[PDB]
């Protein structure tokens, strides 16, 4: 909801309200980064001429935004940590443990391991920073969190993903919503006959 | 569980365990409801001198289970202990079921009376006879004729008018019952033949 009503680059004042137009943009970049990973975001925000101009104004902000767009994790994680540090210095710090970096890398890891089947932990580690153990524990923590649809073959140190087909994943979504709405109609069956 | 005291091969131990079942029947239900197997063992153990009252508490077990008809059958097989007490609500329930059974059996055995009748149980006929006899002798003939007509006996109206004819308008009362209420001639013939023989 934030992004959908906040990409509008029509400011009531040239530099006011949110302390600047540059601060306005940084909020836009953060919100969009939380929003989505890489659909035709090239045609949604990257195509934005004012967007490209303000990223020219802020090189580091342009750096991580292009790093996410290019899916180059070696610079992405360092820049993502810089982003989290910057958000710490900001009063809009509400997702202190949920959606600073963990959600963005959940999107990034999903983007990475999708179109992959069995990418080795040792090589995905160096392609995504350093510390093979650090990536291994991060993957284990996020799989426990629920996202990163994959499993880890520890005896061989492999990342065997389980991406459902379009039919399979969507069928899973329908049975989930069927569960929620059976709960709903059972509640409504409670509402009746009383 | 007290079921072990009945599971012992000592007849005196069995009898001791099964005295107070008819007294704890009101308070304890779950323990007696689950003990159907034990009372079946006691019922099968007919060499023990308490077969009849074991069948009585077997009917009490089926009172707990909710099978009033099966409890009726068990107290039926006990025989003389079906009518231990004539004034209770469970007694009223079982006699009402037995009257319904007697009514159905009498109707079908009168619709097909040329032999091959379903065996009229001596034990069932005995308790039935006792129950409507006392319901006739309670000296409330505004309802004695009504329960008699519900019982559906061929000779019961004749018995009612041959006994103490309290409220002698009962003759006209049963007259209008057979004139308007009872009209299905196939089983009406019993009331009709009594009605013609008296009037």
């Amino acid at each position: 909801q934030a992004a959908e009503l906040f990409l509008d680059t029509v400011s009531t004042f040239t530099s006011y309200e949110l302390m600047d137009y540059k601060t306005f943009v940084t909020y836009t970049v953060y919100v969009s980064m939380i929003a989505l990973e890489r659909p035709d975001l090239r045609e949604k925000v990257i195509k934005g001429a004012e967007i490209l101009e303000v990223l020219h104004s802020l090189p580091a902000v342009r750096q991580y935004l292009f790093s996410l767009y290019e899916c180059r994790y070696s610079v992405f994680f360092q820049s993502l940590a810089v982003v989290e540090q910057e958000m710490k210095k900001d009063w809009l710090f509400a997702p202190h443990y949920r959606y600073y970096v963990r959600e963005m890398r959940i999107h990034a890891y999903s983007q990475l391991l999708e179109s992959y089947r069995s990418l080795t932990l040792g090589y995905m580690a160096e392609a995504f920073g350093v510390g093979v153990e650090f990536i291994d524990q991060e993957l284990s923590r996020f799989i426990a969190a629920g996202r990163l649809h994959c499993k880890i073959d520890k005896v061989n140190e492999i990342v065997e993903t389980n991406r459902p087909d379009s039919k399979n994943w969507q069928y899973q979504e329908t049975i989930k919503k069927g569960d929620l709405l059976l709960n709903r109609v059972q509640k409504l069956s409670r509402v009746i006959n009383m | 569980g007290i079921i072990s005291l009945l599971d012992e091969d000592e007849p005196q131990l069995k009898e001791f365990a099964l005295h107070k079942l008819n007294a704890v029947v009101n308070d304890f239900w779950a323990e007696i409801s689950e003990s159907v197997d034990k009372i079946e063992v006691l019922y099968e153990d007919e060499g023990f001198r308490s077969r009849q009252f074991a069948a009585l508490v077997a009917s009490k077990v089926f009172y707990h289970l909710g099978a009033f008809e099966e409890s009726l059958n068990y107290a039926l097989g006990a025989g003389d202990l079906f009518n231990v007490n004539d004034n209770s609500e469970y007694v009223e329930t079982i006699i009402a079921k037995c009257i319904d059974h007697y009514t159905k059996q009498c109707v079908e055995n009168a619709d097909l009376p040329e032999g091959e009748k379903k065996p009229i149980d001596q034990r069932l006929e005995g308790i039935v006879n006792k129950m409507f006899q006392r319901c006739l002798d309670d000296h409330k003939y505004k309802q004695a004729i009504g329960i008699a007509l519900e019982t559906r006996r061929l000779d019961v109206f004749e018995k009612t008018i041959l006994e103490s004819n309290d409220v002698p308008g009962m003759l006209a009362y049963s007259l209008k019952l057979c004139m308007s209420l009872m009209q299905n001639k196939q089983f009406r013939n019993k009331v009709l033949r009594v009605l013609v023989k008296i009037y």
Binding site: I152, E160, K167 | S33, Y90
Partner: protein, 444 residues
């Protein structure tokens, strides 16, 4: 003196308002007797507790002396039992029955209500012996009179009777009364009365922890589906609690979430607290992660904060931290009766962690799982995964070489059909809705 007089006059006016509420109740029963309608009776019983929180001994004696224009046993019982205050300046025109109204005998329904209203008033006054005597008179009168509409009254009357006897600790003695009225209800097909008596009986077995007898009776006693919503909720919760004690886990979670949904959302604060604690403990034992949105309950913050830490301990797999918090704030868990389960979760935390990590990993090392969940033993890790697979909670298998575990497979014949097979009861719900409509489309 002006302020005190104004306050006394105002409270007397509210006392007269409550008397008019009781007078409205009397007119409701006059209409109910005229129309043979127990539904508007149910409305009267629904509206009584709303005004029940503010009554006065003097206004009760006013209603007693007014309604009992003709001398009756109810007035003779209330004269010594009801202790009205001293002389009061406020009096009302007590002449509701004149001529034929006074000549006609008292209605059994209003007699049961005055008796039930006295016993609620005695308990509000925190009296026991007089309350039990009025309640005994109520059940005696209801037993003697055999009208059909009285047993619907008798349901809630026996309900509150045994609730009083629970405070009296006669909750053991009242069992004979409960069973005797159960037999009468069985004779008269009084499903609501049956529902009340089993609920009282189950609470009796709860207070004595007589769970083996409770489960043996529940497994054989059929409960009415069309019973009252509150009685249904209490019965279902008690059934859920005893199944939880019985380790009937999937049935427990189904019953407890059904009971929570069946309870009124605006009321039943104590019932709500109990069901939150029940769902937290049972689902944590299951490993079914507790519902996070339930933590926003405004009435359960302090009780669920240690429960939140218990959830965190269950996910993590640590022992010492939650053992400390149990030693700190475990007394309320003992009062709720889940402390034996609490320790069971404390030692089944490893089982829950094994399930979650098995869902996480494809081929996890037995050494790795032992290190993760603080086993420090390859053999104990092998035993745990052996015990998980034999329980069938997870699909993790054992290969004594290194601990292999199979992965999933693409969708088969029945994997697309098990939702429709388990969900096509939609039309069964539709047909019972339609049948209820057929029952509930009376034209006049």
């Amino acid at each position: 003196k002006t302020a005190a007089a104004a306050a006394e006059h105002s409270q007397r006016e509210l006392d007269t308002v409550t008397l008019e509420d009781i007078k409205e109740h009397v007119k409701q029963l006059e209409k109910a007797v005229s129309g043979k309608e127990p539904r508007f009776v149910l409305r009267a019983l629904r509206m009584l507790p709303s005004t029940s929180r503010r009554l006065n001994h003097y206004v009760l004696y006013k209603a007693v002396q007014g309604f009992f224009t003709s001398n009756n046993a109810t007035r003779d019982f209330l004269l010594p039992f009801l202790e009205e205050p001293m002389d009061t300046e406020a009096d009302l025109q007590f002449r509701p029955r004149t001529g034929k109204a006074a000549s006609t005998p008292l209605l059994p329904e209003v007699e049961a209500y005055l008796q039930l209203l006295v016993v609620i008033f005695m308990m509000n006054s925190k009296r026991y012996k007089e309350a039990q005597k009025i309640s005994d008179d109520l059940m005696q009168k209801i037993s003697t009179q055999n009208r059909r509409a009285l047993d619907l009254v008798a349901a809630k009357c026996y309900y509150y009777h045994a609730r009083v006897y629970e405070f009296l600790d006669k909750l053991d003695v009242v069992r004979s009364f409960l069973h005797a009225r159960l037999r009468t209800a069985t004779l008269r097909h009084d499903a609501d009365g049956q529902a009340t008596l089993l609920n009282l009986l189950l609470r009796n077995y709860l207070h004595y922890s007589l769970y083996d007898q409770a489960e043996k009776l529940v497994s054989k006693s059929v409960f009415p589906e069309q019973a009252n919503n509150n009685e249904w909720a209490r019965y279902l919760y008690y059934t859920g609690r005893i199944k939880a004690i019985q380790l009937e886990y999937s049935e427990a979670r189904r019953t407890m979430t059904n009971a929570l949904r069946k309870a009124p959302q605006h009321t039943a604060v104590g019932f709500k607290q109990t069901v939150h604690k029940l769902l937290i403990v049972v689902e944590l034992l299951l490993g079914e992660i507790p519902d996070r949105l339930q933590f926003r309950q405004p009435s359960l913050k302090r009780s669920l904060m240690p429960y939140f830490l218990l959830t965190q301990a269950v996910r993590t797999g640590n022992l010492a931290k939650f053992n400390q918090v149990l030693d700190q704030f475990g007394e309320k868990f003992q009062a709720d009766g889940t402390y034996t389960l609490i320790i069971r979760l404390r030692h089944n935390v490893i089982k829950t962690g094994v399930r979650m990590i098995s869902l996480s990993y494809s081929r996890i090392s037995l050494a790795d799982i032992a290190q993760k969940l603080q086993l420090d033993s390859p053999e104990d890790a092998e035993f745990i995964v052996a015990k998980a697979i034999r329980d069938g909670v997870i699909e993790a298998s054992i290969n004594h070489e290194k601990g292999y575990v199979q992965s999933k497979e693409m969708i088969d014949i029945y994997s697309t059909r098990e939702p429709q097979l388990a969900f096509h009861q939609r039309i069964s719900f539709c047909l019972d809705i339609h049948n209820m409509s057929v029952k509930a489309m009376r034209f006049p």
